[PDB]
Amino acid sequence: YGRTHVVRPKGTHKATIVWLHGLGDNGTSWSQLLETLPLPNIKWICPTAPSRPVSLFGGFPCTAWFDVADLSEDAPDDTEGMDASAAHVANLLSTEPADIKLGVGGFSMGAATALYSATCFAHGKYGNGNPYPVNLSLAVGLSGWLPCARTLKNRIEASPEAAQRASTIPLLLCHGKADDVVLYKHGQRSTDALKANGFSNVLFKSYNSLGHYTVPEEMDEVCKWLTANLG
């Protein structure tokens, strides 16, 4: 794993959010955006993914939360890699006292790992079957997609308490229609896959001219949504 940058809460610490960067990026660059947001009371933990051989890049190593081969809709899910990063995020979040609210967010591949974490919390276990140890208050995905949508129904249907957790967890999906890295249709299908499987508190915000990056109008919606769903 890479080097982590932590943004100290400027006011009364009430929530801790682990924010996951995109492919080839690092946590420090995201820490410098998050610390400009009008969000006191939130501690930002920005880790950096391991520089991992990426099959999409012909095996070239770079920072990645999980391995990706192929860009098609049928591509393999690196469940082992996603569970490892989800368990890593969970370990980071397990450092707070019990009264601190816990969330996870990310951009692109980091958004995918954040959304996958939310489905592990709903399922109550990782993809390998180990129990999920942390109580997530929310998750945010910017310009990403939902991994392991194929198995989401079977995982949620494993328990009535899984469906209860899925129905209450607030999820924010943001995507730009001009995105040429992660196509906008993946944002719509991730929202549809979540809603179809019991996640009844999913908000999907679209921006028509937004590409594969962030804009202040998008981040302003993130701030308002985080303020409301964290109290």
Residue numbers in the entry: 19 to 249
Paper excerpt:
To elucidate the molecular features encoded by these conserved elements, we solved the crystal structures of Arabidopsis thaliana SOBER1 and Zea mays B6T1C9, each representing a different clade in the phylogenetic tree. Both proteins fold into a canonical α/β hydrolase architecture and superpose with a root-mean-square deviation (RMSD) of atomic positions of 1.54 Å over 210 amino acid residues. We found that a loop constituting the hydrophobic tunnel lid is the major component determining substrate turnover rate and substrate specificity.
